């Protein structure tokens, strides 16, 4: 056609479709697609046009154009109080890319040397403290989420940082920053300009984190004179980065990339672990639990890099399929800065364009019987899996996240079995920013494998 995507009619004035979307994100999107006879279509969120790239065959039209054409900056305006002014997506595109590359470099597999033991240490410490009886009842999502913050901190931060800012206090500062976020501001940008009590809190937590970082940096320069230590961590990595123009990252920027890394990795990784365990313990999946048991059957007590990286293909499939079925990020978005072709249409300058892992992961051609968790499945449409994104803004933490998931799975199932206290795997809870299993349905019985 070369014209605009078909518009889905608005029946609710002012609000547009946001209500029907919350009620049933997948159901609503699939209904639009059916009724409009197009995988590319435009919905309306509080007056803003959102064009969905809902055909897995057209994913490349979303993930591949340059920032200058499809930009994430405006979509992330509401996180500026957390990352900081001029940090990540708020910085000019070449500088954004530089800061993101500096972070990515700290999460490459060449940094993973002592991560496996760090993760195992923290996981065993947690299990010993909280899974300390022959059997007992626990909330698996809460416990996975506590292990992820502990493990991430143990891997990424040297012992000195941890003595001043341990995983508990770090989680508290981050939860105070996160608590302040108003993602509605994507569609109601007037919010970003208002005095809100949120802003004061957020600024508070961030400035306290940045104070702690500066104090750590000053202390480290002193251990440098003494040659007591030479700590190599996430912080030292970003500290040594130098931009193309010859200058270093400011403290502001360093702090902001640390916050982005920690925000990003916490919920997604915790959720992926939780789903993966929930599926593995369910009676319908005994064959898959068997397979994981076989994979790890001959592993040593103290795992190494090679065991997790190279000898857990099935665990990795489990993690990936969990993300496939229940993607923690439902909608990836960009601001359209200039007219782009998508499918047989032109998406106009000023639209938000979106591509939905939720929608695409449930395309029946790409993923037959998509509600069936099957780690042995393989995509049947090229590039249909987008749980880690793709192209210009593809996930830079994927290997680190999967490292943690797989290690937790090997560590946990070595020492325990688990029983779901429900007939079914929990329902996904779509009411949060990062989507996981319904927290109240995640009660499980652990059983110590004596």
Contact indicator for 322, 386 with CB cutoff of 8 Å: no
What region does 300 belong to: left with phi over 0, alpha with psi -120 to 50, or beta?
beta
Contact track, ligand VNI, 358-397, x by CB under 6 A: -------------------------------------x-x
Contact track, ligand VNI, 19-58, x by CB under 6 A: --x-------------------------------------
In whole angstroms, what is the distance from residue 366 CA to residue 119 CA? 34
Question: Which positions touch ligand HEM (CB under 6 A)?
Answer: 72, 100, 103, 107, 260-261, 264-265, 268-269, 272, 323, 328-329, 332, 387-389, 393, 395-398, 400-401
433 binds, among ligand HEM, ligand VNI, none (CB under 5 to 8 A by kind): ligand VNI
359 binds, among ligand VNI, ligand HEM, none (CB under 5 to 8 A by kind): none
Burial class for 435, CB neighbours closer than 10 Å (0-12, 13-18, 19+): buried
CA distances for 406 relative to 79, 220, 276, angstroms: 30, 33, 10
Binding range to ligand VNI, per CB under 6 A, among 194-202, 205-213, 261-269, 407-415 = 261-269
What region does 40 belong to: left with phi over 0, alpha with psi -120 to 50, or beta?
beta
183 part of the interface to ligand VNI, by CB under 6 A: yes
Closest residue to ligand HEM using C-beta atoms:
397
Q: Which of 292, 330, 384, 412 binds ligand VNI (CB under 6 A)?
A: 330
186 binds, among ligand VNI, ligand HEM, none (CB under 5 to 8 A by kind): ligand VNI
Is 144 annotated to bind ligand?
no
Q: Which of 260, 347, 353, 366 binds ligand VNI (CB under 6 A)?
A: 260
CA distances for 307 relative to 22, 74, 110, 117, 280, angstroms: 41, 42, 15, 11, 20
Task: Tell me how far, at minimum, the Cβ of 260 lies from ligand HEM, in Å.
Answer: 6
Backbone angles phi, psi at 242, to 5 degrees: -130, 130
The encoded tokens of residue 5 equal: 């995507």
In whole angstroms, what is the distance from residue 146 CA to residue 88 CA? 27
Q: Which chain residues interact with ligand VNI by CB under 6 A? A: 21, 88, 183, 186, 260, 263-264, 268, 329-331, 395, 397, 433-434
């Amino acid at each position: 056609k070369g014209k605009l995507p078909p518009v889905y009619p608005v029946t609710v004035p002012i609000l547009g479709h946001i209500i029907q979307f919350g009620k049933s994100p997948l159901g609503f999107m699939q209904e639009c697609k059916r009724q409009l006879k197009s995988g590319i279509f435009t919905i309306n969120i509080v007056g803003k046009r959102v064009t969905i790239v809902g055909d897995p065959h057209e994913h490349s039209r979303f993930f591949l154009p340059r920032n200058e054409v499809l930009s994430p900056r405006e979509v992330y305006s509401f996180m500026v109080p957390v990352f900081g002014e001029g940090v990540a997506y708020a910085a000019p595109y070449p500088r954004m890319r530089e800061q993101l590359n500096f972070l990515a470099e700290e999460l490459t597999i060449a940094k993973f040397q002592n991560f496996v033991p760090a993760i195992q240490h923290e996981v065993r410490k947690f299990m010993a403290a909280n899974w300390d009886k022959d059997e007992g009842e626990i909330n698996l999502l809460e416990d996975c989420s506590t292990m992820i913050i502990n493990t991430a901190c143990q891997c990424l931060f040297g012992e000195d940082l941890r003595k001043r800012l341990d995983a508990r206090r770090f989680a508290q500062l981050l939860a105070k920053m996160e608590s302040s976020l108003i993602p509605a501001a994507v569609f109601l940008p007037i919010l970003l300009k208002l005095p809100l009590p949120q802003s004061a809190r957020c600024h508070e937590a961030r400035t306290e984190l940045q104070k702690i970082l500066s104090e750590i940096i000053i202390a480290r320069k002193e251990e440098e004179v003494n040659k007591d230590s030479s700590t190599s961590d996430l912080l030292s990595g970003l500290l040594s980065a130098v931009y193309r123009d010859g200058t270093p990252m400011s403290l502001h920027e360093v702090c902001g990339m640390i916050v982005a890394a920690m925000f990003a990795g916490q919920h997604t990784s915790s959720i992926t672990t939780t789903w993966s365990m929930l599926h593995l313990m369910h009676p319908a999946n005994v064959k898959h639990l068997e397979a994981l048991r076989k994979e790890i059957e001959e592993f040593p007590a103290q795992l190494n890099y090679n065991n997790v990286m190279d000898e857990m293909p099935f665990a990795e499939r489990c993690a990936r399929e969990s993300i496939r079925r229940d993607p923690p990020l439902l909608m990836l978005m960009r601001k359209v800065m200039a007219d782009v072709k998508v499918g047989s249409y032109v998406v106009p300058k000023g639209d938000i364009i979106a591509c939905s892992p939720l929608l695409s992961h449930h395309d029946e051609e790409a993923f037959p019987e998509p509600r069936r968790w099957d780690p042995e499945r393989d995509e049947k449409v090229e590039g249909a899996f987008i749980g880690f994104g793709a192209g210009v803004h593809k996930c830079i933490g994927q290997k680190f996240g999967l490292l943690q998931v797989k290690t937790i799975l090997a560590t946990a199932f070595r020492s325990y079995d688990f029983q779901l206290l429900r007939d079914e795997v929990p329902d996904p809870d779509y009411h949060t920013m990062v989507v996981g299993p319904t927290a109240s349905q995640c009660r499980v019985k652990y059983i110590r494998r004596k």
